[PDB]
Symmetry: D3
Subunit: 320 residues, 6 copies
């Protein structure tokens, strides 16, 4: 349904961002750095036998306390590499046993809970906090605070996500040389922002990323969650310019252009949640060393368990 | 798809409410009455010629400033009857010209904007304000603050709505003894709440009501917006009892049981958004003088323009 | 899903029409004009308080008696501007209270009931009368389609022309300020009247239907355009005749003849009336014109926002 | 989705008809018999080799001229049994070769075209003739529904009775072995003819439509029964008048009067013609009768399996 | 939804086949020729009166016994032309009375049952006989797809070549007028036979399936092509193996080799067999050829209109 | 959409099985046990660090070689309890890392690959081995359904009984602490194993499929149950035969014979495995049992909540 692959590979749409993109993010991170990180780990009673699981609490956007899980495989290694895992839309940190892949592969896994979501396919425990009034919005998170980048939901998520990397680095068994940032769909869009904004992340795993190239996304598909923005615009007919202005500060394409760490991307050519031209726009602008795995017959599931093996091999080759 | 009509007409399921239902509502309304109502009626340059439209502002839940419209038909009579109109889900106050029916029929019309919504089919101008943290929720309004009645979204909307009647009553040209409360679907549910909670309403028009008999609604249909609650529960599998205890304080069946003012209901027997059994549970418990117009072949549109004429005739008879 | 906006704005494709288009319509109107208009306005008992409602009857196609409403706002004015309102597919005149917008804005509103429809979303009271009723697919789009002389829209468009003469006959109507308006089917009817009427002074044309039929069926499989496609799936031998008939009714061909000022609207995600069909008509429209473009709306177009634009537009025009 | 089979078999709900049901039909048929039948059989140049095909024209309702095909298998016998075939909703007579089953089984087949339809899945050549064509929902189900004298099926069912007279006029037809047959709309028409024709000798009634309307619209939201629901959703003041009209055309009411031997079929998962509507009709049917029950089939019913059952049923019936 | 027609007419994509395409088919066919054909025609008791029906069995792929019907019109001519009919996806030979068209037009019809299918819209009676039956997606499209030697259509296409020899062996068949025919799956089978058989005289290829697989799975998400997509969505490591296997069975590669006169049909709105897949095959077809193009039709194609075109085409070819 | 919870808890429909049910299974398992099990475990080079992964091969139905995974957590305890895991419809054994749950909780996990499937959502490596593969609807539900001796699940259920013996042969498995587990198709397979094998200590049976087939096809039209309905729609003469065969594989009949303690789960909104089908099995389940009821869940059931419940249930059992 989207551009053919030869064209996708060359797709570099003209970017749109405001003159103060970097200032906005510098100011955002400085204001939240005023609150102590205060990373707290507490060992959890669980039935897990090959992993030690910890409850995590750390200060994200403006000192607000975000939950997570830390999963440490029980191995002979002194320091271990770490994957910081960001979660898809409507998900949250779930149970420790929802995240066994990375620890089973010998990586500590830091799972960041997603403020105010956690109700659509995996439970969450962390609330959101608005900057004052909660404006008229379409159901969901995509238009929550959208009339101002200062009030916009993902300002708070992305800042949480940057602070999560610091929280993971605070656990002493984490090898700070081998902290990886990872996610699919919303988790991939979050990881992309972090790849530009964190100075602690060493590598990026970005699958079927959401939050990329919003302007094109709403022209290409009518699926959720991108349709929340379309549906908001269908009603608020006078707000096009302001909505896209706000979104430009959170667009993965604009972060990709600033990001310098090694990355492995994946895309499903039949994905109609995250259309391939949106994924390719981000990939093509990504300024670090990069590869992409392309799945021509997959929808939003992308490479699934095959991609998971690709990630393990990529990281092994990168860190050796 | 629902019970046959002969059974709908007798359907009076055991009600479920907590022992402190009334006290919850007394304390809520009392806390909000500590702020001055401070109703403002500012003439809005519209292009209307047979109606004068005022931009309304008034203090609803916890003094929060709620928007509305006040439309006055161009008639001499020093005191006119008044319809206070509440709005369907994802709607908001829109433009003054969106509400010309009741003014054209000789009634002043007070249209209350809906906090936080106004983004699905008609625009709105009024924000919500949470009680502190914005808990994990499913997209929309149905599960916003659902883990505690003190935090639940409809606490705030219902309080706004009671206060809206007071605001309408403040307008010098409104006949304080001919104040009707009205709405369809979400608007119907809010009106039904108001019909129990306000001391100032003279009659109820309650069309295809939503927010009624939640526990059964979600068994019968999988449509939105009731599906937001199902979908929350599909994830938060441990929260059934808490969710339904919270919803009990906002259930139109429990309000119907307390309401004493005359009412005209309507129902579409093929309505799969507000199932017939949910509307009939509310209607059958409704404690005031009452009549119901039944539309056997209609879905959620109910009686449409036909029902509007039934309303005009009902009020004329009542007020003679 | 259709051409990008930069291409829609330049989209002026080769028009298809027969050499006798104007003669067809001159002969149609002249034949119907032999019957007296006989416009009848019967004041009616109503619950309305700010508006006076009249039941209307007038002679449309071949003297057939078409219903309407006339809604007159109660204002201290010896003459008032007037909007002649045409109705969307499967609708009809409904109740007087269904049409309160234009009277509330200070316009007399003449609502024309639509022959034979009135059964999908708003009730109607006017029958159709055929020229035999040929084999057709369910609906109105293919009724009489094998010959322009028998086609359903010959009758509707005649009715609609006659409606404006009927409105002009009400004494309080300001004949310098008669507006023709409609959305979707209403807008396709309005485009035809904008070419054919001797009485209309402005056009409001929203998300128009009955435009560029040959391209519409290639772009969408929605109804009501799909009635045409489904007819042709069965009558495999009738492609050329069907498009020949439709060319006499195509809003793109009317637009090219129309001279009055116009305000259009279009939803770029409208899959009932695709944007390239709407832009074909708008771009060929020969009078002074403007268009409001709603990039995120489907067939609802600009909704209540566009209603505000209309009132502003007519106020400027007529001041 | 409907009643379980044990209950369907006992389902014999209270019938609804007006006091003048028989009078309505007697006068309808009397009036149409005033016009000469004038059945015209024109040998049609054909590529067919085992069958002789004829173009048929005959006088149906009020003398209106209806098309058909006559297909005669090339056999030695002087007189042949005959199946009068009625056609499903949105179909028409199509081509001669569309109807080869019955001829191949040694039966002359008279295929009646369906007035005004012919545009959904197979083409047709016969027009309808109404005077005013009232507001209606798209299609045939609500055409003229506010009065049984104007209703579309009054004309179809008359045409269908006249068809049997026309088939019987063909010299090679054995008038002792005239079968009336159809599926869905075809079946509902055949059910009416089983009560109204004095010439039909046996009925093949598959997955019948036009039965138990009031219950059909409560059970399913499919077309074409949904045309009726959608008309009532708009004309909310007309529920009584619509069902009164429909009572004169209801297969259940015809079934109670029909005397000829019949073979029915039903699909238990058919959501076009719900099984309760079909069993209501079957259970009231007053002639010698059998029903083939296909529990896993939708509207296709027994398909080719049923065709074999019909052949066997008629062989045994006719000795 | 596909290429516009002017581009379809010129669509001649680079073909993909392995170096050993012809050798694979020569060895396949030589191996199956080592088993005796042993055509068996058992005359059946039938209700049919204009046609003689035979129960057919013959040896297809590797001596496996395949069912069929032979329908002989009762005609004075002692040698008759013959159409060997292949059946659409999920069908099978059904009953003899399912196949009356060609015998009514004076052709012997040999209907080939389809191994292992017969369970979706018409029953069948013939099993498949594979070795191990590899992991597969539900259906026939992926059965044995990891190796052309194990692939399901190797066996169907061999059956189909053998069916033409079985038809030829019936004494009343005129071996100079054997036609091979099908639609959709039947048309892809017929197209393979048009390249592989030395006995067929003409090809009727309607809306052909089993063409240009690589592109089909990009254009549509419908079944049955979506079985291939779904297999690849799971077996993410097997893209190259899958399309290599499929290249031995692609109608486009057979069309390039076929020499006999052909009449194709295509529906421009067919989203089961997309127009670009059909035209790729049609444009490579190396024999004398024509195509009937149905711009408004989906997968039904020309339906009964095309059946007429077929009968005319063969009459002209053979006279 | 199904019975209310109060009725589901009381739903014990009359069972249907043939008089030779036990004999059929006795002979089936005896014939397969004549071939050596020959379990082979090969340590796999793996990226996994907390788990030792082994490629498994073993003899299932009639010596046929079935793949699997053996996942051993790296722990001190020399003899570990073991969960034998059966896979959902269209799945297969996938990668070792797809099955980390049970090993992470301290259990050796034996994952049985599913013959012939492995192509819908997780890839598989094991073929099926039928002679003739009868006419069937796409998928596995109707493969060999005309005889219980040839039916697909005869083979799978035998494989699954043999998997328990193959897990028991691994030296680090505590052969006295083996559990059988599955969701949907995996739950139906585990249920059969709960009746057929004497080795298992406990059953984990989530949203079970393969239960109460006769009722399943009346209640939902979803796949995979709809493959059966679809087969019956065409093979209209095979209802009795199809249900007789299925009675030998019906989870409700195996439940009646199972004695080991069980934890079931059910989604009350599951329209793949309807609640009445799951309750019919659960209600007839003869051993100590409990059911987790998820009223707001569809076929996902309890998901990770249910997994926690399983870990607790086994912990109590093996203390
Ligand atoms: O894609 C994600 O970010 C998670 C999840 C998912 O994977 N698909 C989808 C679609 C709509 C809403 C939420 C979801
Ligand atoms: O029903 C309402 O309260 C308003 C509106 C409506 O009329 N139906 C519907 C369905 C889903 C969301 C919103 C709506
Ligand atoms: O578009 C119209 O003319 C009215 C109405 C409408 O607004 N959409 C639609 C689609 C199908 C039939 C009728 C309609
Ligand atoms: O059922 C019929 O009478 C004919 C045909 C048919 O077989 N099904 C169906 C459904 C809607 C419209 C028309 C049809
Ligand atoms: O197209 C065919 O070969 C037959 C039949 C058909 O006509 N369409 C279709 C689609 C899916 C499966 C089977 C079919
Ligand atoms: O339910 C299963 O056994 C697995 C999988 C599933 O979870 N749902 C579903 C539906 C159709 C085919 C296969 C499946």
């Amino acid at each position: 349904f989207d551009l053919p692959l030869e064209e996708l590979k060359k797709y570099r749409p003209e970017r749109y961002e405001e003159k103060d993109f970097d200032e906005f993010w510098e100011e955002t991170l400085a204001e939240s750095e005023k609150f102590p990180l205060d990373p707290v780990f507490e060992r959890m009673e669980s039935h897990l036998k090959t992993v030690e699981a910890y409850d995590v609490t750390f200060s994200g956007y403006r000192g607000q306390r975000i939950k997570g899980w830390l999963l440490v495989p029980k191995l002979e290694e002194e320091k271990l590499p770490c994957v910081v895992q960001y979660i898809g839309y409507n998900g949250g940190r779930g149970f420790p046993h929802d995240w066994l892949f990375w620890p089973s592969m010998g990586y500590i896994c830091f799972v960041m809970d997603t403020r105010g979501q956690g109700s659509g396919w995996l439970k969450g425990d962390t609330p959101d906090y608005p900057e004052g009034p909660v404006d008229p919005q379409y159901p969901g998170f995509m238009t929550r605070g959208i009339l101002d980048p200062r009030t916009y939901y993902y300002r708070r998520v992305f800042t949480d996500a940057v602070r999560a990397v610091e929280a993971a680095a605070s656990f002493p068994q984490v090898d700070q040389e081998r902290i990886v940032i990872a996610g699919g769909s919303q988790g991939g869009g979050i990881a992309l922002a972090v790849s530009a904004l964190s100075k602690k992340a060493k590598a990026l795993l970005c699958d079927v990323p959401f939050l990329c190239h919003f302007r094109r996304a709403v022209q290409l598909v009518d699926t959720h969650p991108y349709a929340e923005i379309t549906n908001f615009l269908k009603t608020h007919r006078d707000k096009e310019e302001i909505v896209f202005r706000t979104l430009s500060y959170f667009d993965g394409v604009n972060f990709a252009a600033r990001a310098k760490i090694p990355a492995l991307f994946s895309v499903g050519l039949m994905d109609n949640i995250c259309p391939p031209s949106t994924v390719f726009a981000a990939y093509n602008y990504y300024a670090g060393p990069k590869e992409i795995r392309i799945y021509p017959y997959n929808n939003h599931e992308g490479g699934g368990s095959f991609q998971a093996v690709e990630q393990v091999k990529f990281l092994k080759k990168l860190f050796e």
